[PDB]
Amino acid sequence: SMEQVAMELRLTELTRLLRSVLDQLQDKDPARIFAQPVSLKEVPDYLDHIKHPMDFATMRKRLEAQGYKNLHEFEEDFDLIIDNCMKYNARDTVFYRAAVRLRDQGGVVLRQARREVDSIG
Numbered sequence: 313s314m315e316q317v318a319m320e321l322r323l324t325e326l327t328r329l330l331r332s333v334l335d336q337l338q339d340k341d342p343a344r345i346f347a348q349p350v351s352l353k354e355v356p357d358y359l360d361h362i363k364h365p366m367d368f369a370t371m372r373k374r375l376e377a378q379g380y381k382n383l384h385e386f387e388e389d390f391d392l393i394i395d396n397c398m399k400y401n402a403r404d405t406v407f408y409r410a411a412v413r414l415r416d417q418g419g420v421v422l423r424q425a426r427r428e429v430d431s432i433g
Contacts, residue, residue, distance in 0.1 A: 333425045340417040345410040366392035
């Protein structure tokens with residue numbers, strides 16, 4: 313149908329906007345602490361601590377398969393990256409501190425993304 317195509321153009325445009333949001337969030341992590349999944353070879357207990365691991369490469373795979381239906385789902389994954397880190401790593405660590413700085417900096421990008429998603433529909 314024509315509606316299904318219009319829908320798919322919206323999903324495609326959302327994917328376009330979320331791709332740009334993802335790039336901007338990831339620039340706030342120049343150390344690449346959140347770039348890839350936590351290694352289960354190097355942290356073999358990780359899943360005993362963290363039940364839903366997340367990272368930017370995993371978010372990008374979902375994104376490129378148009379797996380985010382709306383901004384809320386994308387924010388959920390970004391918040392997992394942060395929140396997982398802040399639970400697994402202690403407050404005095406470079407990892408925890410990196411998550412705080414990413415949360416703080418990402419806030420600004422996410423604020424305007426919500427406006428753009430509402431605004432453009």
